[PDB]
Motif scaffolding. Sequence first.
Motif, PDB file in Angstrom:
ATOM      1  N   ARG F 123       0.811  -1.216   0.000  1.00 44.51           N
ATOM      2  CA  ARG F 123       0.000   0.000   0.000  1.00 44.51           C
ATOM      3  C   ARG F 123       0.845   1.267   0.000  1.00 44.51           C
ATOM      4  O   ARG F 123       0.372   2.321  -0.435  1.00 44.51           O
ATOM      5  CB  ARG F 123      -0.929   0.011   1.211  1.00 44.51           C
ATOM      6  N   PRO F 126       4.411   3.574  -4.323  1.00 46.06           N
ATOM      7  CA  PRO F 126       3.682   4.189  -5.445  1.00 46.06           C
ATOM      8  C   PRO F 126       3.789   3.429  -6.751  1.00 46.06           C
ATOM      9  O   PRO F 126       2.961   3.650  -7.641  1.00 46.06           O
ATOM     10  CB  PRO F 126       4.321   5.574  -5.569  1.00 46.06           C
ATOM     11  N   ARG F 127       4.774   2.554  -6.902  1.00 41.27           N
ATOM     12  CA  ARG F 127       4.910   1.762  -8.109  1.00 41.27           C
ATOM     13  C   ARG F 127       3.925   0.608  -8.187  1.00 41.27           C
ATOM     14  O   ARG F 127       3.756   0.037  -9.266  1.00 41.27           O
ATOM     15  CB  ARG F 127       6.327   1.212  -8.214  1.00 41.27           C
ATOM     16  N   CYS F 132      -4.191  -1.465  -5.480  1.00 38.73           N
ATOM     17  CA  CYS F 132      -5.048  -1.432  -4.305  1.00 38.73           C
ATOM     18  C   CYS F 132      -6.402  -0.813  -4.621  1.00 38.73           C
ATOM     19  O   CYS F 132      -7.348  -0.963  -3.844  1.00 38.73           O
ATOM     20  CB  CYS F 132      -4.357  -0.659  -3.187  1.00 38.73           C
ATOM     21  N   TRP F 171     -19.341  -2.618 -31.875  1.00 35.15           N
ATOM     22  CA  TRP F 171     -20.544  -3.118 -32.528  1.00 35.15           C
ATOM     23  C   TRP F 171     -21.766  -2.308 -32.128  1.00 35.15           C
ATOM     24  O   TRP F 171     -22.644  -2.050 -32.957  1.00 35.15           O
ATOM     25  CB  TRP F 171     -20.758  -4.595 -32.205  1.00 35.15           C
ATOM     26  N   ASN F 175     -24.034  -0.022 -34.785  1.00 27.13           N
ATOM     27  CA  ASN F 175     -25.406  -0.468 -34.955  1.00 27.13           C
ATOM     28  C   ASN F 175     -26.404   0.474 -34.306  1.00 27.13           C
ATOM     29  O   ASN F 175     -27.563   0.099 -34.124  1.00 27.13           O
ATOM     30  CB  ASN F 175     -25.590  -1.883 -34.401  1.00 27.13           C
ATOM     31  N   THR F 176     -25.981   1.679 -33.945  1.00 29.62           N
ATOM     32  CA  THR F 176     -26.873   2.655 -33.341  1.00 29.62           C
ATOM     33  C   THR F 176     -27.373   3.635 -34.394  1.00 29.62           C
ATOM     34  O   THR F 176     -26.581   4.215 -35.141  1.00 29.62           O
ATOM     35  CB  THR F 176     -26.153   3.402 -32.218  1.00 29.62           C
ATOM     36  N   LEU F 177     -28.689   3.812 -34.457  1.00 37.54           N
ATOM     37  CA  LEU F 177     -29.289   4.834 -35.302  1.00 37.54           C
ATOM     38  C   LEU F 177     -29.336   6.139 -34.524  1.00 37.54           C
ATOM     39  O   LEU F 177     -30.021   6.233 -33.502  1.00 37.54           O
ATOM     40  CB  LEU F 177     -30.687   4.426 -35.752  1.00 37.54           C
ATOM     41  N   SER F 178     -28.609   7.139 -35.002  1.00 36.69           N
ATOM     42  CA  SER F 178     -28.442   8.400 -34.292  1.00 36.69           C
ATOM     43  C   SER F 178     -29.306   9.465 -34.947  1.00 36.69           C
ATOM     44  O   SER F 178     -29.080   9.828 -36.106  1.00 36.69           O
ATOM     45  CB  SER F 178     -26.976   8.826 -34.281  1.00 36.69           C
ATOM     46  N   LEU F 179     -30.278   9.971 -34.204  1.00 36.47           N
ATOM     47  CA  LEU F 179     -31.192  10.993 -34.684  1.00 36.47           C
ATOM     48  C   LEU F 179     -30.963  12.268 -33.891  1.00 36.47           C
ATOM     49  O   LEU F 179     -30.961  12.244 -32.658  1.00 36.47           O
ATOM     50  CB  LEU F 179     -32.642  10.534 -34.548  1.00 36.47           C
ATOM     51  N   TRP F 180     -30.765  13.371 -34.596  1.00 39.73           N
ATOM     52  CA  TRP F 180     -30.534  14.655 -33.968  1.00 39.73           C
ATOM     53  C   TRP F 180     -31.860  15.410 -33.903  1.00 39.73           C
ATOM     54  O   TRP F 180     -32.926  14.855 -34.184  1.00 39.73           O
ATOM     55  CB  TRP F 180     -29.446  15.415 -34.727  1.00 39.73           C
ATOM     56  N   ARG F 181     -31.815  16.673 -33.500  1.00 40.25           N
ATOM     57  CA  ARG F 181     -33.033  17.467 -33.415  1.00 40.25           C
ATOM     58  C   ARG F 181     -33.352  18.175 -34.721  1.00 40.25           C
ATOM     59  O   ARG F 181     -34.506  18.188 -35.154  1.00 40.25           O
ATOM     60  CB  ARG F 181     -32.920  18.497 -32.291  1.00 40.25           C
TER      61      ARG F 181
END
Lengths: 99, 183, 121, 74, 58, 183, 117
Positions: F123, F126-127, F132, F171, F175-181
């Motif tokens: 503990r 530092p290396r 922990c 993946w 495979n995500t359909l991205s719709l904006w405003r």
Amino acid sequence: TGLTDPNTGKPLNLSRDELELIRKVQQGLIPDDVEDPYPDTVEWFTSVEEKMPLSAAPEPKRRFIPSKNEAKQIMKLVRAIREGRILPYKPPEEREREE
Amino acid sequence: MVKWPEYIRLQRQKKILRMRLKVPPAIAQFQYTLDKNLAAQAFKLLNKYRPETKQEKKERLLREATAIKEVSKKPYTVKYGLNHVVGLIENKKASLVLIANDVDPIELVVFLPALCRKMGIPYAIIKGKARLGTLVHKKTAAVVAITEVRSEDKNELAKLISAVKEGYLEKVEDTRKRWGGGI
Amino acid sequence: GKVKAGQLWSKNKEELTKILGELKTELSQLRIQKISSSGAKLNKIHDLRKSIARVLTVINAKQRAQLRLFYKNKKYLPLDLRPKLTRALRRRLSKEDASRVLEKTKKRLTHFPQRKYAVKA
Amino acid sequence: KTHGLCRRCGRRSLHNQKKVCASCGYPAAKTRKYNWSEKAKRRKVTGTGRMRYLSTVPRRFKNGFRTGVPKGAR
Amino acid sequence: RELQKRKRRSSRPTIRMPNRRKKALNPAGNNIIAKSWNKKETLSQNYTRFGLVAKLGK
Amino acid sequence: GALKYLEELSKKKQSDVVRFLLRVRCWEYRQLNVIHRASRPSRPDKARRLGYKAKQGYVIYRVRVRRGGRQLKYQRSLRATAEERVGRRCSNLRVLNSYWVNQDSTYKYYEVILVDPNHKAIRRDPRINWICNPVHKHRECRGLTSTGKKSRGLNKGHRFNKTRAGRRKTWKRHNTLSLWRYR
Amino acid sequence: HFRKHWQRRVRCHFDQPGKKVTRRLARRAKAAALAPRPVDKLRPIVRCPTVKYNRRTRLGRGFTLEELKAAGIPRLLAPTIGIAVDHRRKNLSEESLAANVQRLKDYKARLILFPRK
RNA sequence: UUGACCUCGGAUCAGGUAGGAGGACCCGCUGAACUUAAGCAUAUCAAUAAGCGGAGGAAAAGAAACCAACAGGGAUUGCCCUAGUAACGGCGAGUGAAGCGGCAACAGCUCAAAUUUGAAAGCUGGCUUCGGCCCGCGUUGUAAUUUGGAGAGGAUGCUUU
Ligand SMILES: [Zn+2]
């Protein structure tokens, strides 16, 4: 089936289980027939004696002078004696006037 | 009949196997260890060059610090540590080398007789990694080297070195290249 | 019937354990004669029960404080006296261990720290 | 009777001959839970019972998991 | 979901978390920037008053 | 510099001294348990370059794994199986790294380096005290070790396009359909 | 191209006005900590790789070691005064070198430095 | 006879730790069918669902055995575009990237490979008058120095705590 030691030893006596354990690992450790599987070592590299050190790196000055680390440890004890936390050195003659 | 414990039997079977198999001639050379006289005369010189213990190193530091509150030469000790000694071998800074015969990863010491032979430093395979550790205030020590001794005993070191190249390395000469075991 | 906790904290240990016995023997004797005409005796039982809890609280708090005075120098506190926190908070690295840094890193921070500057327009 | 009382989940789902619960699997250390029954998950999930210790955790976090007493208290 | 219905019916109080942030939004101290930073103007508007450059990119 | 000589020795492991040592050690390990504790690594050069230190908190565990096919092939490596069995055995430690130590006709033998995250020698360093942290619980199960990173294909290049940022994360992103405003 | 379950993996962006507020608050939160300093570190001027964009020029990652030494900025000081440093990039031509040691010389003219303690 | 060293065990010995829950999001393992191709088996479905293992407030990834062919770029990640392009395809069903470019955010480091050898300089525990004493680990290597767009060692002179 006692067979004499190849290094001019003595006719050995080991049990049959001891002989079977030898034959088991020898079967796993055998190159082949015909060619010599266990030759002597020709010292083709250690016959020539190296005369100079391997590393041509310079030697640091800390090998020719007193120790830096020992000096820093001394001054840490000096501050302990200055602040009285550590008793100063008592010679064995003073130890003879002790316990 | 009676039954023996598992680790008890394996200790004996490994001893049989390491001495009766067809041992290559870098492990078989470790079976040849120096005589009782030469080992005793080696430790007569080496005990005179024992490293300081933690108790007496602290005492000396308290001595020199006290004198500052109110001049020496280079310390000649016995060199130890595998990584340290191999470097002392490679820079030709060692004069006599002692190698333990029971290093249980033996790969740590297989090259070490031949490396001392290549650079010309006299070596001797010794019984006891425990004996060398006692000499150098540890539990164990795989290798022990002497580099330079004080002027009062340069003669008995050169005599001990000559007793290794005559009493040990001459007998090993035509039997260190041969395979061990057999049957 | 009811005993204020302000009088409770001032008294010492033997005065507490005598008063606690006096409330307990009184409480047991009530319920024997409370089974008939459980009127103001029932209200007394409620006040007797609360006064027992206040007495038992002061004894425990005094005993726990005496334990914490005893273990003020020892490093192995009993489990009942250690702080709860959470499970994961008790296995986190200490504040001094996680702040510990290497000697090479401290050397670079000592001699090349982050400066304070601005850029003119 | 095929099933008896189960110590863990309290139902009458412990098989008598096999001594394994049909609802929680009492001899198993893990509680029986399958993703094809979302209704069965929400029947035994956290929050459907007493929440005896876990209800106390949100208040203690808000105060920084402090220990001690207020200044000048009796 | 089934946890949230228990708290609606329980007599235990809701623990209202104060609106805290890991990082403070406005500089503080006795230095020059903190004593002249306006709470209601943006980063660009504040650095314009100082005469300093906020972004070194394009 | 003894460890440079050991690195060249492990390169030549069909040779006479290394075939002998691997034979006599594989025999010894077969009488031992499936998972057992080793006091010191059999290849100390390999363990040290993989992170082993001679500190209180570092342990070495040796495990034999069955070899052959699962023609179904197990995508989990034998090395990853070696890590997962030891971590189950030592639920309190952290698997750091593993390396090949021996093999047979039926079994393959691995030595695994583990670090105690509760030992305060660990503990305070530092290396190593990154382990922990609780994000490093059971690294061998999540594929976070050297075997796991190889089998997950976490390497730079056009060859590892599907797997370098996580195969399932790649993946899900593709495979995500991205719709904006304001479409 | 709706052969798989596109219903389960459709992502809208109604947090677009809300993420912009957070991003602008992160830049304000950063400037509260680094109050006289600029928010972003200085970056070099580099040429775009391909034949399509050879004529265009953009900001790079960090300044080369030869650019820093020519300008007079020590290497170990540059990350502590707002200069990004790239050890991978090389100069390979005098035109890339001269454009960046002009930029670092222009940075030093506009830079005001405050002493340590 | 005694005492080491190694190895393997015992102990209701002292100090610790793991299990289970939750699992929307995250990292691995394992892995299916219907459907479509107006039949159906390659393919699709789908590297999905179900099953198993393991974490966090994020995780994972991450500071090139990279991209490129340039007048060059320069850790990782995400958005837009590249682009339904290249590529592979019972060339049917269809499947389907990446580099460049504009952005968001930016941060770099630790070992192993060396002889501190003019001084294991390091560390865990225990007793503690809290100040400093013992045991043990460790030379089969614990500190300091170094990590290849580097570095070491000398020399020299300025600059930093
Ligand atoms: Zn049940």
